[PDB]
Subunit: 217 residues, 2 copies
């Protein structure tokens, strides 16, 4: 199925790992925000929010917002292997709630603060590194994540990585290329290495993350 994306994009990488986890092959279509590919006719026609990534199902069904896509992929494509779906997206209300919680934490907090701190330094006007307030706020998000991982192998608990691990795995890999020292958070560091070593597509994650590093030189 059609996947409009960009390698350095964390959300896109999140979807890439998830697709690999469920055995779906994505028809990669590089949506270089050049010429305003997202503000383009055909595209805006699919996603009026012109945000990336954007998925177009066989029936032309259009979906964007990585995390929503991740769930979609599992529910519609991973479910053939009930053991898998349950591993990546636990059906128990309590377990799933924690997964959802982490997914929301990832968008609204973990990546949000990452961007709010770095985007001003790498884009637009390119600010001379830093804004202490945003740095602490960003580090606070890492402290949170570190706590979530206290005595846990995976971000949302459980015995196997979930959709949440992949999502946050994408975000955190971006933190690394950004040059932040994750060693400063034992659990995150530990989880990162470990998870990156057993997850499907971890390779495209790291590779795409590296691409994003292009901005941090």
């Amino acid at each position: 199925m059609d996947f409009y994306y960009l390698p350095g994009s964390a959300p896109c990488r999140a979807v890439q790992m998830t697709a690999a986890a469920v055995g779906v092959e994505l028809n990669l279509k590089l949506t270089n925000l050049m010429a305003g590919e997202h503000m383009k006719p055909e595209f805006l026609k699919l996603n009026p929010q012109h945000c990336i990534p954007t998925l177009v199902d066989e029936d032309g069904f259009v979906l964007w917002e990585s995390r929503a896509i991740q769930i979609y992929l599992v529910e519609k494509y991973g479910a053939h292997d009930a053991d898998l779906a349950e591993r990546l997206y636990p059906s128990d209300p309590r377990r799933r709630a924690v997964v959802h919680q982490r997914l929301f934490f990832d968008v609204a907090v973990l990546y949000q603060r990452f961007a709010e701190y770095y985007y001003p330094q790498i884009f637009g006007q390119k600010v001379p590194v830093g804004d202490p307030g945003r740095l602490r706020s960003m580090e606070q998000a890492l402290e949170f994540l570190n706590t979530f991982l206290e005595g846990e192998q995976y971000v949302a608990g459980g015995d196997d990585p979930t959709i949440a691990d992949l999502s946050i795995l994408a975000t955190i890999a971006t933190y690394e290329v950004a040059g932040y020292d994750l060693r400063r958070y034992e659990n995150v560091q530990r989880w990162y290495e470990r998870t990156s070593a057993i997850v499907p597509g971890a390779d495209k994650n790291v590779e795409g993350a590296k691409v994003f590093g292009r901005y941090f030189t």
Copy 2:
């Protein structure tokens, strides 16, 4: 079940409407944020992220992040009534995906930009009204929502409000008390009035919102 919250809080109001929708009674636990009530031992012990709202289930299960809670309430408490659950949280992968999409849109975009624009004016350093960039970015989120509603009764489609309508209904009600003129977006304005007129707990939403207005005066 224990519900730590605050009236003017949009996320809290989102959960309040949802609880009413599924017939759950929350024994409210007003958690004053002004005074680190969310920063004391007992609380941090439940939610290390000390964020509000926070829900504690009959058997000591702790949950935070309104949207995750909304889903939880439906899955665990609304399900006794299949039709109810399917109305508020459609089980079809595509339908649900749109719901999820909107929920993420709400946290990451709609409310995010609302706060990024107003919080600097009514909180901490009450900046002399405005930051043009953030204003356009915020209005852009409204344009998107307006488009989502083009020829649709509910934010995520369907012939009945979903969890997404309630969540965004909380956010938008906050936009109103903030003094923004929603008439500038027909669909949003239309959807708002209508929805606020048929949703369970809508009153509590308008009222709690009013409380938040405390900051805008």
